[PDB]
Amino acid sequence: KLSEEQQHIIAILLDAHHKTYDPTYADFRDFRPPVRMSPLSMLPHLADLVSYSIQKVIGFAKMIPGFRDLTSDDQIVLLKSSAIEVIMLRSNQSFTMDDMSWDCGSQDYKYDVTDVSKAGHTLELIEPLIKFQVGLKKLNLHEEEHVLLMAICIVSPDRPGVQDAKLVEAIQDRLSNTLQTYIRCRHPPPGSHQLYAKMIQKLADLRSLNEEHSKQYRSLSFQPENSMKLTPLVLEVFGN
């Protein structure tokens, strides 16, 4: 039931994800080292981690079918408002539910609830973020559904500042129909609808997590001693 257009969209997104995600986490060696034990000892390391992730999300977004047809202003708008959500989505690949942490190779590069707190964030964000990672991990998504959810997350028409909302909607509709057909090719009803309904609910939870992170990022970045430890890309992308 998967068309040739839908099969090509899936192959491109999987190719894009494989090019923009290194499961070896070798590039973590070049970040500023993590300090677990002034009080925000994990801010430098996690700032480089987010800065690195933003670059990967931009590269992945550029390879989404139809993304380049947008104007530069719309590409910037979609990426500024979705980068935080895609980072939380793509981080699920390293999330393990043994200790509720992101395991990326070593114990140096294994981050838990305390590690996020050593970056300036309260549990008003960390607790819903952990709940999100568990509920997302329990969905047991294929890599095809994972990459389609990331592309649908990026190409959203209801982002503030979007110029050609109809064009963004038309691109998202093709990615959504590709996702709905893939779920039907793998799961009979009514489980197919229940899976797709939970996936869209995760996109709604991302908007809530986006608002909470933005609230705390503004509080942290307003302090010059904290924004001094950020990266130029983070200040440009997360700053508005």
Partner: peptide, 11 residues
């Protein structure tokens, strides 16, 4: 504001 680093990463 302008986003020169974002634009450079967007080819």
């Amino acid at each position: 504001k302008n986003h020169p680093m974002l634009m450079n990463l967007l080819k």
